[PDB]
């Protein structure tokens, strides 16, 4: 056959269930994790040190744009496993409604996605984290619009 | 591994403009020559870039981004398009734009590919972790 | 509108313990990193604490390693700092800060009133 | 640890006139700056995030711009209630470093 791969690498996925928060899974269907990578504590660990492409998907809906302004974030960080020190490495914001709707017309949907990713030098043993400010617009209507992964070059 | 790549960023001290630097990887024959990358030989490789454009304001005229990587091969001695896309970010607040491309290309040895934007004024040139340019040999 | 109120600051001798609370109203609490940032007497501002918006992680400054304790009660809109061990360094004016994120940046935008604590015995 | 040099110490200053103050950074840490400003006795204020961007409600007499380790806060036409310490903070790693300060006075 083929040799197979070697590279560390990882795809996970938000949990729909678990409303509230921004929860990762590897043991659904098209969730991977491989060669190293593990998700312990709901944050990606790295196994070896070297660059790595960080790539994530939020999908945001909402119905209506209400009077008090939605600020929406999206922020990916590490965390060194010596002295637990914490680095930014990401980080987004976007707001979605530009004036509020206006009452006798319908309060059509809107949906907002936000990408974030890049490449980035990791060290071994780093715990990578991704996380929103308001899950209250979250989308877990259907697979493949929450995810979270990371591809070593 | 022998393969050849490369990964190269912009260059801070080259303002008004999109050049990009090889040490702040380049190696194993993938050159640097004229803002462009040399296929040093054939075979298949990924192309991959993105940019990160911001701005401050919204201005009175319109504004569209461009980023494009472009292949002058030795088969076809003409800039051609590999990976392209547009944004219009404005329809007082600070707004922020990246632009992602990659794919899988059969190149031969010798020829150049370019990564290029229409607006360097608007470019993040600095944040190299999300403006950068690069090639990996499968 | 926005109001962010520190609470329980006070005299306390060396080697004793402390709890400061931080009450937030205006504002999505859970849609914030939290923080806390003292200031010394005659003295510039020092950071000490910052927790993440489920509270599941915690940072903390190395002067402060394993002594402070820093939480965060979401359904409450509190936000707590547990200080144990003190000592007289730790004299200082605390404040309580929302470390909100941009695009590739942070700050503190909201700040509270401040409490003051001192260490004498 | 970043360590941001804050420059200079005390600034005197009369009001409608140009001030410019900098933070020179230890490493590299990218637009994760802000600026603040502390008048006697009151809280601190955000003036500027993402080291080039006014905050929410700041008067428009303030700009910032950056080159690589070196941030610079720049006052177009001075105020009375512009009085005060500021502070230049990095955000990128872990502890979160404040500038030592800068005092604006009121010349004579």
């Known amino acids: 056959s083929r040799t197979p791969s070697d590279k560390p690498v990882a795809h996970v996925v938000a949990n729909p269930q678990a409303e509230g928060q921004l929860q990762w899974l590897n043991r659904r269907a098209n969730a991977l994790l491989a060669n190293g990578v593990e998700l312990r504590d709901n944050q990606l660990v790295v196994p070896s040190e070297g660059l790595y492409l960080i790539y994530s998907q939020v999908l945001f809906k909402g119905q209506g744009c209400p009077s008090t302004h939605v600020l929406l974030t999206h922020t990916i960080s590490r965390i060194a496993v010596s002295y637990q020190t914490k680095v930014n490495l990401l980080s987004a914001i976007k707001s979605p409604c530009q004036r509020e709707t206006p009452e006798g017309a319908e309060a059509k949907p809107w949906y907002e996605p936000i990408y974030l990713g890049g490449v980035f030098q990791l060290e071994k043993g780093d715990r990578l984290s991704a996380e929103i400010n308001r899950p209250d617009y979250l989308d877990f209507a259907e697979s493949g619009q929450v995810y979270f992964g990371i591809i070593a070059l | 591994s022998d393969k050849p790549v490369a990964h190269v960023v912009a260059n801070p001290q080259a303002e008004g403009q999109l050049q990009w630097l090889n040490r702040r990887l380049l190696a194993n024959g993938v050159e640097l020559r004229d803002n462009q990358l040399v296929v040093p030989s054939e075979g298949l490789y990924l192309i991959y870039s993105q940019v990160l454009f911001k701005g401050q304001g919204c201005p009175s005229t319109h504004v569209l981004l461009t980023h494009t990587i472009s292949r002058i091969a030795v088969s076809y001695q003409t800039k051609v398009n590999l990976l392209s896309a547009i944004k219009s970010p404005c329809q007082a607040k600070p707004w922020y734009e990246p632009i992602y491309l990659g794919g899988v290309f059969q190149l031969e040895k010798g020829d150049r590919l370019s990564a290029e934007i229409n607006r360097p004024d608007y470019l993040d040139f600095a944040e190299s972790g999300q403006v950068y340019f690069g090639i990996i040999a499968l | 509108d926005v109001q962010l109120v520190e609470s329980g600051g006070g005299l306390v001798q060396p080697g004793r313990s402390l709890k400061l609370s931080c009450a937030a109203s205006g504002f999505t609490f859970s849609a914030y990193y939290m923080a806390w940032v003292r200031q010394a007497p005659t003295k510039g501002l020092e950071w000490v604490a910052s927790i993440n918006y489920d509270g599941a992680n915690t940072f903390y400054r190395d002067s402060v390693k394993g002594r402070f304790t820093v939480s965060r009660d979401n359904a409450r809109s509190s936000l707590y700092l547990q200080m144990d061990s003190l000592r007289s360094e730790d004299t200082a004016t605390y404040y309580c800060?929302?470390?909100?994120?941009?695009?590739?940046?942070?700050?503190?935008?909201?700040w509270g009133q401040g409490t003051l604590v001192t260490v004498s015995s | 640890d970043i360590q941001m040099t804050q420059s200079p110490a005390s600034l005197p200053a009369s009001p409608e006139e140009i001030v410019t103050i900098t933070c020179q950074a230890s490493?590299?840490?990218?637009?994760?700056l802000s600026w603040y400003q502390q008048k006697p006795g009151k809280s601190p204020q955000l003036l500027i995030y993402?080291?080039?961007s006014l905050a929410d409600g700041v008067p428009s007499r303030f700009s910032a711009s950056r080159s690589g380790t070196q941030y610079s806060l720049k006052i177009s036409r001075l105020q009375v209630e512009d009085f005060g310490i500021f502070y230049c903070l990095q955000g990128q790693s872990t502890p979160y470093t404040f500038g030592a300060g800068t005092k604006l006075e009121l010349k004579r």
């Open positions: 993402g080291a080039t």
């Open positions: 490493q590299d840490i990218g637009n994760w």
């Open positions: 800060t929302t470390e909100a994120y941009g695009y590739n940046s942070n700050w503190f935008g909201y």
